[PDB]
Write a protein that binds this ligand. Structure first.
Ligand SMILES: *[C@@H]1O[C@H](CO)[C@@H](O[C@@H]2O[C@H](CO)[C@@H](O)[C@H](O)[C@H]2NC(C)=O)[C@H](O)[C@H]1NC(C)=O
Ligand SMILES: *[C@@H]1O[C@H](CO)[C@@H](O[C@@H]2O[C@H](CO)[C@@H](O)[C@H](O)[C@H]2NC(C)=O)[C@H](O)[C@H]1NC(C)=O
Ligand SMILES: O=C1c2cccc3c2C(CCC3)CN1[C@H]1CN2CCC1CC2
Lengths: 394, 394, 394, 394, 394
């Protein structure tokens, strides 16, 4: 021989190698591939369509008895690059595909001098995992990735791991943070399933566990919710007989009904169960309609509508009690004329003294309903805080 | 001979095999493929464009007389992997395509030692089926998938089933739940049609039947609909002569007219027939304009506009009836001066006693219209419930 | 010879067949292709960009003198499948392309024993046709599809029809209904054009004619338009001196100005001419500003602003006419005191009797303007109906 | 020889033709391609991203000395079709690419008997040109297309034009009108640039000039702008002491503040300079806040707040001037009682005569501010018209 | 030999060249590629998904010992074009890929007569860099591009630079301005990293630094923010006892609550930290609720609700102080009748003189709260300006 290059090694291997035949001497021994993954980013989690988008890195290796030389007498060449096309490559796919992601192709593989080839490639994957929105800002997710052969049986292609499974779980090395989702754990599991007798299919399940960072939503839905409670505490200080107190409490009720609709499109509500913040917005209405349905009771109670004098059953029940429970011939002709004038004024006087008494009752009930409304907001806001400190601690 | 591998089998088959010729000995015998499907997910059901998106799995098998060896003397090899490119593959397409979905390709097939090849592949499909939105939250759909050869006639390619058709119907095995659509049944049917004499085309129709889960829409359109009825029950308790009762009933009517428009874009209305909830929102207006068009009648009836005394035809018709039907020289010079003063006061007195009487009539009609409005809402809400319990039961 | 298969026919044809050369014996005889189409669906009609999207089916056939055997002595084989790659295939494209639609490829053709090949393929096409929105819900469209060779001249490739043109026009066989567009007619036409001397290019024009179903828009723009006229008929029943009648007529005018903007994005207005419903919304404003600009005239007319007595020119012109046109020392010291008291009351009396008279005039004009406003709506709504019955009939 | 076909010409050329070598005898003579374009449609002009989308047609031709036969003795064949793959094809790209448009491929070229090949192909292109939004409805644009070789130098590939440049400018032949953009001119220009010594690169610049049709925006932003000026001319006719005049002028000011925001997303504002209609909407506010800030001055001026009598400095300045500038023991015991009654009435009389005088001043200023507001709108609307007639003329 | 062309050079090289083998004589010497980039445009910076889109140009060169001739005796040919397919091409990818951009392919390379090939290609890239929105209109970004081999180790492929790194930093030559992002610097850096022992991977990091032009957002969020402060300065000039002052201050508060929501979707808020303009909108509310919560205090203070006389503790504290701190038998029978009349009038007089005194106090507090509100806006607006002049200067 002569010394052209290392390329006469590359002629020695790929002269009679056939691309399609599965590379083994005896047809009973299965080819054993060995995979490994690393999470890189989490592009999109679509709650409505149950579709999760993920870019990962990937590598795998398998042995074969056709690409096998002796390293001596080929000028000590140990490894080698060979293009991906001219090598038998196994088909390993994800069961949970719903679409084909766009990923770069890598046109080279390694080949060691025992037959061990290696294959690095990245791949974007769009899968379909089941999500739960039972507790919306504070939620973990548990989506699956299932690597399997698509055609070959378990006496044909078998799947193990590159590294130990304890080392895969704590591999948070290149993951992109600052991106709405925090990666916790990548847990592998082997499992064999059979859809029929004498047809077994090996598979390998990776479980990813991600947790949403709740900080983005404590300003987008907590801030306008408590803000339309601090207005109604200001709103009760209007005296009820003015006329704008009814017009005040309907404007912001309109103003909050716009808020429930313009947010609900950006907050998803998928299958069984509603998110638990949706209950905590209905209670925001019941402290707002009851605030509306008591000023209707006072305006009806304090008005000038030629009404009767208030009842002494409910005068000493209210006025003299609640200041200590919580709060604190020509002569007779003109005499006929003058007395008729006084009769036209004294019934004008009588109609105003009656209207003072209901108006006196109407302020005592307004201060009394103002306190228990102030205690209903105060006892509700402390229950909201103590369910936030339990989660935040540990 | 020698013993290189099993690959000398792979050289024995694919040495003179021609890819394009249809593989049969006698040209009169038709090649019979045999298909099978399993639903996996339902990605999108677009009501407006009548387009349905679905990811399924798929397998098929056919015989041929060129790939046929004896298993003895090839070291007992029974099955084999061969790349998909070097084999005649029949063209089986869906008639209802409108676009090409993106699906992974599988580069291998099996070949048994009688000639039976097999072919597993997944495929995303976007079809065009006719949808009905006649009853929007409670609806089944009946979309079709039609597998057929695209070119060959029925004496060239014929289609049967892998499994029995009773086993295909009850195959809900890998379907993704928790996803807006519940799969009920996949029903197969064979049918032969001819577009011309001496040109018959076999086909195979799969019917899918899906049912929408109505739970997502009982919070997005039922809750604000009944909520703007519980405000108007509070709204009638304002006394009509105050002035804000007209301003109250127009604000929420504005507030509901925003609601009909911001929802109608997310609820589709396609061909013939409107959805039956659209009728049940027009009746929500007729209990809201009539609630508006009666407070206009009371405010016109109770006002100070130098009006005449109310008519005794309609005084004893109303006031004395409806409390039992439902509800319950210097002397004469000053005498000229004083009597003229009393005349200026007694007509001031007379104009207020007239205005008390209409004001008395105006409250009796307000309580009477409040009851039959309270019975119109009550008799309408029970009809809404009993049409929900009939569907929910069985 | 021996009897391997029919495949020795497939070796007899494709042994020396050259793919690129146009297949004819004498170079002067033109190759004549023959096309045919069937509409399948109409995916999208974008009015703004003048782009129309359509999925059709398609077939064509041509003769050639190289693929020509005798059916005797090849075991009577009449037709044959040959892959699409190894055959000269003519380039027939649409002139109106603006993009490339995604369509499945069909890898087989037929070949008869005279040389006639056939070629079935479906193809999605996005074209650019000119649309008119002159009458928006009731409109036909006339878009063109032009099949032509892209390179070859008319002495090289010539185009005729498969079927008679009378049979193509009435082929509504597989078209998907229930989809916003109704197909009427597919009309073919042959035409030869030359862009230069000695360079003629054959082409074939198909005209499609589609008609929009107007039912979807009689609920999305007719219903809120007439609904904000039935409120203003209720709106005039408020007495004008109350104070909310000005506040009533501005709220719904705000409420309709929101409606004109939130709809106009979903209703297109392209080149020359506005759609004729846009005129019928401006007239909806002129019956709404004039309804606003007359209650401003009454409130200015009926008010307490120390005004003068109304003019007897316009008292007998109005009050006594329009009830028949349409509607129906100590003594003198106290005498100095008492007469000064009466002078302070009689000018209080005089200022109210003046304010009764304008207030009397103000109600007669309000009933008179209420009738001719009720006749202006009534005479306008019957003109709207009779332009709907002319189109609906025939 | 024999007479198989014209195909022995196609064997004579492509037997030893090598695809990759640049086809010239002497390596010093440059290959000269010659291009030409025709605009077809303008799909999208994205102002925000500075990206312009265009579909054009394209053709080019070049000579080579390898594809060259004598037309005699090959049965007089002058031209020929050859597939695009087996020919050296130059790389001509656009410098302004930002993405790859989707365009059909044409698999054939012509070859004449001197060596001149020809090549027709259409191509969608997305470029990046700089746009100016300095005057939004009335604007021309000047975007560039630069055809150049991407690798070869100017002694390797050189670019000229097919036709004369005067004939290219006035080629508006197949352009799709009725589509928001009117094509004016396509102007070619040759230019040679060098990025380094001894490395020159030929290029060819086409300038397109397009003009927006402004008709679509005279109904989407001119009509609601002048419409909320004809309401405020009606709005001043309310008398100021009524109470709704303040509530009237705030509702439509709210109503126009919604309008500025819901439009500004559909009207772009890119780099340096704001569009000149944005100035003409700020002036629409200054005629609307000043209309608001003068009714605040009148309501403060006309009110009952136990105020003092108006000053005679400003009484004869206003009231007596502006009607000609623009507008036009028992006895004494009862005497103690009666005089005290008159004292309680005469100060009630005095407080109303003071309130008549400010109320008299308040109407004269309201008519005076109504005229100069009516002249400020009138003098502004004529300036708006005369800037529209200058552009519309020529 | 003869003289066919230069093409016998192209036959001399590519006769025995093998495409897949890495082209070096001795397998120990690494192949050294050398890259260079130029920014062209910045298409999109998506803050929410942390994805940045960029179109760049790119070139690289490497040596090999197989493509090497002597320029003498081949008619002095120095360089040459060879198609890209038939040459070993190294795999250089970006680590930060999340998708595959669409870019044109260049089918030619140069080859010099020493072995140096060259390769020009453009490529669109979508990467994933970490963004900070800590200060929203005034922000620089620091995103990375990392060119590396994907498979080969550092004794196999090594990466250096074409030009000096000082020349790459100041290369702003073809960058498209007028496009929301200004390019500052492109800084290169070499770094070697090892993921394992005996496996080192060379890489090359380019840092891009871009700065947002803040001019687009000084009209979209600064202008309506200060505009709803100039209305409330007009808003306090209404006298508080009128009745519309409460209705005025709630309409624009509704009007600004719409503004905070319709803008917050177009302004992103990603990971840790809120943008600093979000603090400067909360302070816009605290100058707006406090403006609301003081007119509630005045309306409660000035009202007719049969209240008591104001306290002389707080009369001389306020009224007599703040004008210098800041602001400036028949006889007795009628005597029984007449004195009873005077008693009915003098308590009518007394109830109005009490209501004058609170009304006098209520105006002095309104002018006093008007000044310190005018100083709170003035002292806040100057702090906003001086934080704009520090950034604008240098
Ligand atoms: C659609 O538009 C074309 C416009 O070209 C119509 O074309 C005319 O068709 C008639 C026959 O119906 C020919 O005699 C004319 O010469 C055509 N016009 C031109 C300019 O060539 C076509 O009829 C239209 N479709 C319908 C249904 O009216
Ligand atoms: C579009 O912009 C180009 C800018 O380069 C204009 O270019 C100039 O064109 C004139 C001839 O019309 C040349 O003499 C100048 O040298 C060009 N300028 C430069 C900087 O090279 C072009 O005219 C513009 N189009 C129109 C219609 O005005
Ligand atoms: O893909 C991978 C990859 C995939 C799976 C497991 C592991 C890796 C590593 C590191 C070891 C663990 C590196 N990498 C890439 C990083 N660099 C770019 C391509 C690889 C080599 C260099």
């Amino acid at each position: 021989t002569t010394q052209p290059a290392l390329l006469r090694l590359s002629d020695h291997l790929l002269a009679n190698y056939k691309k399609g035949v599965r590379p083994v001497r005896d047809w009973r021994k299965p080819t054993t591939v060995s995979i490994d993954v690393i999470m890189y980013a989490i592009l999109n989690v679509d709650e409505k369509n149950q579709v999760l988008t993920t870019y990962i890195w990937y590598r795998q290796y398998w042995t074969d008895e056709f690409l096998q030389w002796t390293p001596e007498d080929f000028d000590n060449v140990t490894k080698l690059s060979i293009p991906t096309d001219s090598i038998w490559v196994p088909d390993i796919l994800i069961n949970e595909f719903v679409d084909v992601g766009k990923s770069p192709n890598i046109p080279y593989v390694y080949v060691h001098h025992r037959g061990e080839v290696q294959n690095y490639k990245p791949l974007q994957l769009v899968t379909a995992c089941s999500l739960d929105i039972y507790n919306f800002p504070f939620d973990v997710q548990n989506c699956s990735l299932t690597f399997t052969s698509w055609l070959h049986t378990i006496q044909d292609i078998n799947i193990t791991l590159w590294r130990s499974p304890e080392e895969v779980r704590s591999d948070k090395s290149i993951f992109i943070n600052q991106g709405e989702w925090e990666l916790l754990e990548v847990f592998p599991q082997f499992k064999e399933f059979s859809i029929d007798i004498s047809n077994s299919y090996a598979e390998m399940k990776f479980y990813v566990i991600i947790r949403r960072r709740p900080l983005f939503y404590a300003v987008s839905l907590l801030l306008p919710s408590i803000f339309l409670m601090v207005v109604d505490i200001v709103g009760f200080c209007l005296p009820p007989d003015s006329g704008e107190r009814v017009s005040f409490k309907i404007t912001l009720l309109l103003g909050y009904s716009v808020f429930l609709i313009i947010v609900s499109d950006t907050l998803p509500a998928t299958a069984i169960g509603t998110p638990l913040i949706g209950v905590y917005f209905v209670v925001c209405m019941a402290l707002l309609v009851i605030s509306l349905a008591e000023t209707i009771f006072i305006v009806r109670l304090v008005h000038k509508q030629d009404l009767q004098r208030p009842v002494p059953d409910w005068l000493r029940h209210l006025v003299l009690d609640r200041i200590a429970w919580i709060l604190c011939l020509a002569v007779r002709g003109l005499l006929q004329e003058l007395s008729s004038i006084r009769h036209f004024l004294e019934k004008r006087d009588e109609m105003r003294e009656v209207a003072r008494d209901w108006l006196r009752v109407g302020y005592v009930l307004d201060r009394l309903l103002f306190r228990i409304y102030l205690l209903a907001v105060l006892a509700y806001s402390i229950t909201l805080v103590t369910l936030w400190s339990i989660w935040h601690y540990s």
